[PDB]
Amino acid sequence: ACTYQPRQYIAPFDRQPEGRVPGIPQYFASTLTLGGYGTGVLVRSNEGRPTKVEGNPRHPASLGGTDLFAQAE
């Protein structure tokens, strides 16, 4: 009812990841298959969680582009 906002706790790590800067998303190169055939995707991990999928410019059949299924995965 008062104090405008609750306490809002914060829980950091116990051992920091070696190559992660907190608050900076990273990108990993993976592959998504539709009918058994692969498609190279560049997927974004915010804090170790996948959130967005985009095209892999280095991969044939996905020159910076994706289909609706790769986005909805």
Binding site: Y4, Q5, Y9, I10, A11, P12, D14, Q16, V21, I24
Partner: protein
């Protein structure tokens, strides 16, 4: 004189006067509540689960701020130290002590330490520590003299006008890239001249862009 006593003529006028005062007092009470230090939790020393003293670790031991908040000049988020940084010293310092029991219970088990956030934002604000630090803005002008706080408190409420004051007039609060240290540094007497020169050298954009809505809210 028909149905009213003699004094009522004075009382009626006084009552109208008293009514106006009560109305004005009502608006006053309302505004005071929404700007108080209890509603905004300003100057309140929030109790932490492990009772960490910044005064002991900065002014006495002499640890740099980037030793603990390592992500402040690179991302929007100032890193909160993991238990590994605490165990780097307390594996030998003050080991087998009750004040460090929670820290020693973590690191052995994957459970984190649930600190309480002192500086809180309503999640539609999107603050960025990296751009502020790299443009000559120190922690003293924002979090205050944290180096001397045994318990951290909110130096002032994070209003929108408080951000707008610096964004519209950054000449008054800009500093010459000695922000990470120099908590003892204070604005020079000729802050306006130095500030205008620093704004021109660092390319701080005019108030027309910095007052835009999407610079903060998204």
């Amino acid at each position: 004189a028909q149905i009213f006593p003699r004094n009522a003529n004075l009382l009626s006028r006084l009552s109208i006067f008293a009514l106006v005062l009560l109305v004005v007092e009502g608006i006053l009470i309302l505004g005071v509540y929404f700007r108080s230090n209890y509603f905004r939790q300003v100057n309140v020393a929030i109790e932490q689960p492990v009772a960490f003293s910044h005064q002991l670790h900065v002014n006495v031991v002499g640890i740099d701020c980037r030793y603990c908040h390592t992500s402040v000049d690179q991302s929007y988020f100032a890193n909160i130290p993991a238990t590994e940084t605490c165990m780097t010293c307390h594996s030998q310092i003050k080991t087998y002590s009750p004040l460090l029991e929670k820290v020693r219970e973590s690191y052995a088990t994957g459970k984190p330490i649930e600190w309480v956030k002192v500086y809180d934002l309503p999640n539609f604000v999107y603050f960025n520590h990296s751009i502020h630090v790299n443009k000559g803005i120190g922690c003293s002008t924002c979090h205050g003299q944290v180096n001397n706080m045994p318990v951290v408190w909110q130096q002032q409420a994070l209003y929108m006008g408080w951000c707008l004051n610096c964004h519209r007039n950054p000449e008054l609060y800009v500093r010459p890239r000695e922000e990470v240290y120099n908590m003892d540094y204070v604005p020079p007497s000729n802050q306006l001249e130095i500030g205008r020169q620093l704004v021109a050298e660092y390319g701080i954009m005019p108030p027309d862009q910095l007052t835009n809505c999407y610079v903060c809210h998204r």
